[PDB]
Symmetry: C5
Subunit: 213 residues, 5 copies
């Protein structure tokens, strides 16, 4: 019967209620309860390289994945619901930031995440980013090389650790008719040491080598 649809809605509603409007929520990672965030970029386009200001504009998808015990559930208690979509405001998200942007990142996609019964969150914002990049050599065979680091703004490696599944930037969705073609693009986790601080900070360094098509 079509009543099974009404039972599906009630089960989701109760699940969300149990995880948000009842269970003690998430204050962010701690030194004793650290969090690993998996990061990966899908480079869609180099829109603009500005040699009068040394800014380059990228469009990319930033894939983020982390896992919380306070988001786990048994699907058997909720009509075998295995995953659900929720607004990215309802849950805690990591403060992953580009370290050398020259204006605020523009969000191209709806700020919605996917939560899975094991406590997995997948969040993949499409973004347009202006960052510090000298495009000298872009009109040559060798091309120009630029880099931008992404990491937490406020957490050290003892609270947020970063990892990549791979060192290769996903280029399978690169705009085939861009003004610029990619010679190579890598994403490398770096354990970074600052003079201020005994504890290391983790970033992912995005190195893009490119030239005019």
């Amino acid at each position: 019967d079509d009543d099974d649809k009404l039972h599906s809605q009630a089960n989701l509603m109760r699940l969300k209620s149990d995880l948000f409007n009842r269970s003690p929520m998430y204050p962010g990672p701690t030194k004793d309860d650290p969090l690993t965030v998996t990061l990966g970029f899908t480079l869609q386009d180099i829109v603009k390289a500005d040699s009068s200001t040394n800014e380059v504009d990228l469009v990319y998808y930033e894939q983020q994945r982390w896992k919380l015990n306070s988001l786990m559930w048994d699907p058997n208690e909720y009509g075998n619901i295995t995953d659900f979509r929720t607004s990215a405001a309802d849950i805690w998200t990591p403060d992953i930031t580009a370290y050398s942007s020259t204006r605020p990142v523009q969000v191209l996609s709806p700020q919605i995440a996917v939560v899975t019964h094991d406590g997995s969150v997948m969040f993949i914002p499409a973004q347009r980013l202006s960052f510090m990049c000298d495009p000298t050599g872009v009109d040559s065979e060798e091309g120009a090389t630029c880099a931008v680091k992404f990491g937490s703004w406020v957490y050290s490696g003892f609270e947020i650790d970063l990892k990549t599944d791979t060192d290769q930037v996903d280029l399978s969705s690169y705009y085939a008719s861009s003004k610029y073609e990619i010679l190579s693009a890598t994403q490398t986790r770096q354990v970074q040491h600052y003079s201020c601080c005994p504890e290391p900070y983790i970033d992912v360094n995005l190195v893009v080598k490119f030239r005019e098509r």
Copy 2:
């Protein structure tokens, strides 16, 4: 008192729907939703050959049906139909896949709800998307394409469809810098490595050239 009874019936209905009964948490695998999508292309504003971006203005017609929004007009003084702010209901997360700037909304964010639980939502939008306008200065013109789909829902939660593969050009701006040779909107089913579920988009293909 004729007016006052029709206003009270509307406020009662909106209450029953939006102060009860109880909520709507989006589509699921067991409770999937059909969103029908259609485009009315008004203008190609700008084709920047220095960055390969093209700016479109269009209306995006979205229609879907929720049982939680159904009512019997007989219970509410023959109200078959009402207007509501789009912030007050669930709407689908239909997104352009290759935009270069956040989409800019041109129209009031208001939807119409019919007693059959059907929702009609038609935002007007300006979109910048990835498009190489090479050839636009010629008789063959340039061809550009952009896909629209849910960002987060798969084909098992939202079934995207169209009523036609023909973009509505009946209000394309007659004095645009660009004339439309053709504009089509096509449903495609796509799979990604990570994931068993299908993902559905509508591909909008526009062929265009500079107006004489």
Copy 3:
């Protein structure tokens, strides 16, 4: 100390109207609302022939009248009108049909409600819209038009009219880059193959040229 009671009188009035009473949920077929619309054209700021976009600054006068906003001044210390945030009341969704960028509001979003139930709301706006400015550098000038109308209501709900078909030019900026040769605002009735209901818009037609 009437100054103290003057405040409590207005406080009580706003309470009685916004609380106490059944809410006004907008117009319906059962209860159509006449909305009067008129433009005061202040400046043609910019005419872009690369994109066929023209930028206007104008005041958009909106006027309508409601039973649920009427009161007797004697009951409220001789108060005959009050100011209120436009966010606190229903306002009409009058939209440019061919803008190219979201309209930018230049004035505080505040309306004036009078005891006879009439609302005055006059947003100052900057609008980019579809206009071919060819011939602006000549004596005959260029001619462009843009239609304003409700996005979601038909003529059965919003009975849209103008008080005059002449655009107010009494404060068009005397040192503008462009001079106005004429500006008219004309109500039109249109029909669509979806809908039995008539649809109404106001067509702002501006003829203009480079000042010399």
Copy 4:
């Protein structure tokens, strides 16, 4: 231990005062013909950033001083441990709807939107703004320069509800940017009255007239 004991008492008093003003008393409904308000307006001109002769728009940067007084914001400092004034977000109080009448773009606020309220009920509010307004800069490349003007007034209130006032007709140029592309020859702010056919009430504005030339 009268260290952070005085400090605790002073913090508690401040929070007691704000609570007594913004919770124990009904929300201020704005001025009326029987309870009218006088807003005192003065400008501090900081910079003429740009003069665009292809659109006839000029961009100004200035501080707009606004001051007014309300009985509902008065208090006795003795009942609140000698507190004479406090700072508050502009959003937590009523502020007048003073608007430029010939802007071509929405004003951009450069400063934090915070006001200062004094025990006599007076409020000081000084937002820094960038403004694009209608201005023909022909003459800017001359000795007498170019002259432009922009009126400021309430958008929805007549002079019977919000009266507008200046302390002086001289614009404050003591903070004008000395390396600006444009130098100021004069800047005045003059109160004006008129009537409209709609209404019997006087309508008031302050006309900011600026005379300027290219600095060389």
Copy 5:
């Protein structure tokens, strides 16, 4: 077995809850309760120098630091937690403003502060700022000199004592491939009085000498 982690989260929720729900929140600095705010700059890039409007665009990190008794806790009472991060909207923050910006500041970093057990708040927004600056001489060896002041918009020196750790601007992460190189950058505390009024107003003057790069 090991869910002393449960727990670790419980301790932090309890702490934030104790500081934000069970104790009176700070109402801001006052005459009788003045605050010391320490301000410091890390210059990242001079993006753009516009000679037709006399505007220059800077990207910098603005270090802000202050200390409240009401944000102190005993780490022993909360499972040894010595610090936590929290949205900047949750706490009071200083209204430090550039005095000569020509566009509203743009924040580039998430608005999150770090609070330590002694009542310390560290808050470091990355910002892009357009300000008033005549870049004449930027194409020469001497370079051009520009300056911009930062201070409280609404508080006098009787409520906020503005301070620096040092007069040298941090250049250790200045973008090496910038269009402009830095010759010098100083941050100086200034006390000003206005004929208007008896209270002093404190600011930090950022003075940057810079020129076009020749790399």
